[PDB]
Design a protein around this ligand. Structure first.
Ligand SMILES: [Mg+2]
Lengths: 50, 31, 221, 319, 79, 100, 219
RNA sequence: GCAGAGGUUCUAGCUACACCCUCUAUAAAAAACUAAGGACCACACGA
């Protein structure tokens, strides 16, 4: 189902695409996995810990 | 000289200041 | 060697265009594209809002009656509007709206030079019949991102994080050119994405001036 | 609250008793805590440390330097100056952190290497930066792990911290002779990806003048990172009475293995970088480097190998 | 600046007496007006003492005989 | 809202008291960042003492862990609202879905 | 808003003339990586330099062969040749001969001048001869290339390293002039074959890069 | 500057960890300045 969903859009069915380095500017070999995962932010901020 | 002070490091803006005064003592201007 | 030129500027949309540089050889294409992209994304002079004063709102977290959302969401929407100025480095925008209806950027009482490039950008929605919001938006030019907590007076002044960055997505592609008779020549096309406050041609030219001046640290003209 | 009330013997025995709570181990001044950050740019002899933490911990030192330089006539004025965080105070602070080790300390100090000295590098932020190599020694994660920092005060304390507790001085764990600062998780993956070979990779077959040419080919992008190519290397061996002799030969290898050759010190042979270089291979490499070259070359080689492993793991994109 | 004290401990094969002798040297440099023999490179006393030990001209024996001579001319100061 | 979820985020947000669920259906006569007024439908209101519903959303309030319990309106003027529907996006809530 | 913190040289550690380490302290955030990568690519992939590209042995036609009297295979012989740093005048190509015999190493100083061609490493070793009757002679072809042309893209074919640089590696750490943000501190270590000074090579690369943006300087 | 008091400020300021001057029984020509207290049990959470 996820593969078909990727195929629905322009994104590849493999789920991982080629990324170019921010500084060097040439693409990373072995295309890396990207996506929009829901990640939180815990209340253990560094401001409290100093 | 025992006035309440903001702790060092923490900052921000005051959103509201609520004052509770016991009956008998006259309340100040802000109260 | 060969000199890249502004062979074409494909203004595909109102916000983002597609600039083309034609003459480049092995390496130059990727090198110059990456350098231009890094210069553009790093330091491009924008004109984002940096300071807002509301007519009757004491602080950033309060709420006035008649407005759809909080003042904080109003400030965050204000940060999103794209505004460009021509003459003045500093300008104050006054927004006066009354009655039911969304408060888009089109109703800002702009001056002669300052103009809103996205008038449809909504700021807040007025809901009550006798609901009026009067804000004095302070917009100034700047480079890069500087938050309101790392800068430098009245209690009624509200600080919004500065977002001086006209460009949001710079993508370049290096592909072979179509010169009259030659090989090993590539054209650099940059798919720069802007909020509308900067002309892609002048943005590319200014980024290249910054890069060239940064190279003058040990090289004479 | 219907609880047994503490007696004259409940405060001499137990975890909360005076012995184990106030005599065996007691709370100390000149101490601060924060979450930890990788900061790969550091060298294991040094660690990152926030400006606020250096300002608070080294307050007496800053006061002393202010009095010596006459910026503030009195401790009281100097203390006000430290509160104002005046720019002159930061310049004074950079002077008292030049060669003043601090004792990084994780809470469950299981073994000797739990607490180690570091030269603090003033960083803007609020999280202590711990060198990636010493994380294995500390058994420290980067998942909210907090470690205390202690400031040695006396010349004896700072001096013995520098001479003994420095991460440069703690390469082999006290439990066993095996190295403790070995490339652990990510740098080892970068080295492993670096030291492999495709049977058919871009730029395979041509002979290379040396590791410099291998780096030139890889960076230019016309040769794959791991392609079986013959290179010429100046391998140095100390088979003499301490003198290092040079052996030049065309050893069949890959570009990636040739990249590491410029990192390794002179004494190490090429047979140690010619394998897949897993965790065990890198541990054996570091042990041989320590037993042959010594301590300082081992430290420099560990730093350089960490740098290259991180850089080429980033270039690898091992997703 | 210095990163490791290896050559110092091959100079002083104790790793403990080294700390004591360099601490005495640092005490002489700070409390006294003693001039470090190796010129500093914007270095603290605790590391310049280790630099002095590294060159081999400062250790327990030389420090002891030097302070003994200073005491000798301290008695001889008043004749 | 999370792009990928489970479908219980709406259930958790509605069941919890962070949001301002609509006890009775109707239309939003007036919506404000601090209050929401719901005009109850004729077929959903009692014959006596029905009137219309008024919801006073809790603005920025100190929480047990020193966080903001902020409730922002999720509806505009004239938007029909049914019984047991979400009206204010409480803390960590978007469109009635738990958005941590 | 257009003002920038232009870097100023602070200390350039001059290692032996084949190596150098150039650094800049001020610069700008994110500009250290930009300048480092730009210089690295611009002088590592495209530089006007002269190097050997093709060698012909009078007695050898196929690569999988070796002369008698020489302990180094012709596979290794071309390996020394590709490292032979040569500087040439306005002529774009010149044939270099190495007619020599007798027992002893064949240093680069024995290459015939064939004009005003200069070899910056006369003591560079190409091959060794161990037999008195043994004689070695080959013709060397060099052109003013503009980068790196591997032999796999094309008579003995030897990899041509036209660019004079041998190694470039820029490390970007933090430097805070006064008390501003953590601005980039570009430090560039460079090794050159010897034809030009590493400082001169970096200056040439920067001239090339700026000279690539002649039309983009707002007049 | 070591035991006390006075001084131009601002009740009081004698080194109290503490900041300037005077002398041993007498009070003012003088600007930078000021404060030295504080446990246990439970809960939840992080590593
Ligand atoms: Mg952990």
């Amino acid at each position: 189902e996820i593969k078909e969903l990727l195929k629905l859009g322009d994104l590849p069915t493999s789920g991982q695409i080629r990324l170019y380095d921010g500084r060097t500017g040439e693409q990373f070999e072995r295309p890396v996995t990207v996506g929009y995962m829901y990640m939180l932010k815990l209340n253990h901020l560094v401001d409290d810990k100093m | 000289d025992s006035s309440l002070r903001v702790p060092n490091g923490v900052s921000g803006t005051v959103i509201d200041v609520q004052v509770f005064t016991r009956d008998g003592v006259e309340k100040d201007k802000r109260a | 060697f060969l000199k890249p030129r502004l062979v074409d500027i494909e203004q595909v949309s109102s916000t983002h265009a597609k600039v083309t540089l034609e003459p480049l050889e092995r390496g130059f294409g990727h090198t110059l594209g990456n350098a231009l992209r890094r210069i553009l994304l790093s330091s491009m002079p924008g004109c984002a809002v940096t300071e807002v004063e509301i007519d009757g709102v004491l602080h950033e977290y309060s709420t006035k009656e008649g407005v759809q959302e909080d003042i904080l969401e109003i400030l965050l929407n204000l940060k999103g509007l794209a505004v460009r100025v021509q003459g003045k480095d500093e300008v104050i925008l006054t927004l006066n709206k009354s009655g039911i209806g969304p408060v888009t950027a089109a109703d800002i009482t702009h001056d002669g030079d300052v103009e809103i490039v996205k008038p449809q950008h909504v700021i807040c929605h007025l809901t009550d019949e006798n609901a009026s919001i009067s804000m004095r938006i302070k917009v100034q030019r700047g480079r890069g991102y500087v938050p309101a907590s790392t800068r430098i007076r009245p209690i009624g002044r509200l600080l919004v994080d500065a977002c001086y960055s006209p460009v949001e997505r710079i993508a370049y592609n290096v592909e072979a050119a179509r010169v009259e008779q030659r090989t090993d020549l590539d054209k650099l096309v940059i798919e720069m994405e802007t909020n509308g406050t900067i002309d892609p041609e002048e943005a590319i030219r200014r980024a290249a001036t910054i890069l060239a001046e940064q190279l003058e640290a040990f090289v004479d003209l | 609250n219907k609880r047994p009330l503490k007696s004259l013997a409940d405060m001499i025995k137990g975890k909360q008793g005076r012995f184990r709570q106030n005599l065996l181990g007691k709370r100390v001044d000149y101490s601060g805590r924060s979450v930890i950050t990788v900061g790969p740019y550091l060298r294991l002899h040094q660690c990152g440390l926030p400006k606020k933490m250096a300002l608070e911990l080294f307050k007496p030192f800053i006061y002393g330097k202010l009095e010596l330089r006459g910026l503030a006539t009195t401790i009281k004025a100097a203390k006000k100056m430290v509160e104002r965080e005046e720019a002159v105070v930061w310049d004074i602070l950079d002077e008292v952190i030049r060669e003043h080790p601090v004792l990084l300390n994780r809470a469950p100090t299981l073994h000797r290497l739990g607490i180690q000295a570091f030269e603090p590098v003033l960083i803007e932020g609020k999280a202590i930066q711990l060198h990636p190599l010493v994380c294995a020694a500390y058994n420290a994660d980067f998942d909210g792990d907090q470690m205390a920092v202690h400031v040695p005060l006396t010349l004896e304390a700072q001096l013995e911290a520098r001479a003994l507790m420095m991460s440069t001085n703690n390469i082999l764990s006290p439990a066993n002779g095996e190295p403790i600062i070995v490339p652990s998780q990510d740098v080892v993956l970068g080295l492993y990806y670096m030291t492999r070979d495709c049977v058919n990779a871009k730029g395979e077959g041509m002979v290379l003048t040396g590791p410099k040419e291998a780096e030139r080919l890889y960076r230019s992008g016309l040769a794959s990172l791991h392609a079986r190519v013959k290179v010429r290397i100046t391998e140095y061996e100390k088979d003499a009475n301490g003198e290092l002799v040079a052996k030049t030969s065309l050893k069949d290898t890959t570009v990636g293995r040739a990249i590491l050759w410029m990192i390794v010190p002179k004494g190490l042979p090429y047979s140690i970088v010619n394998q897949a270089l897993g965790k065990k291979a890198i541990s054996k490499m570091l042990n041989t480097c320590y037993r042959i070259l010594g301590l300082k070359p081992t430290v420099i080689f560990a730093d350089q190998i960490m740098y290259t492993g991180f850089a080429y793991a980033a270039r690898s994109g091992a997703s | 600046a210095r990163v490791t004290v290896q050559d110092a401990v091959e100079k002083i094969g104790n790793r403990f007496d080294l700390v004591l002798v360099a601490a005495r040297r640092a005490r002489q440099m700070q409390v006294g007006g003693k001039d470090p023999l190796v010129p500093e490179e914007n270095d603290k006393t605790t590391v310049i003492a280790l630099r002095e030990i590294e060159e081999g001209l400062i250790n327990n024996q030389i420090l002891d005989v030097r302070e003994r001579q200073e005491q000798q001319e301290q008695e001889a100061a008043e004749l | 809202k999370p792009l990928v979820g489970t479908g219980m985020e709406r259930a958790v947000a509605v069941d919890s008291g962070v949001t301002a669920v609509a006890k009775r259906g109707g239309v939003v006569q007036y919506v404000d960042a601090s209050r929401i007024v719901i005009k109850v439908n004729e077929d959903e209101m009692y014959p006596g003492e029905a009137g219309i519903d008024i919801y006073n959303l809790t603005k920025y309030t100190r929480s047990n862990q020193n966080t903001c319990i902020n409730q922002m309106p999720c509806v505009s003027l004239g938007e029909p609202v049914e019984r047991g529907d979400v009206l204010a996006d409480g803390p960590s809530t978007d469109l009635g879905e738990l958005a941590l």
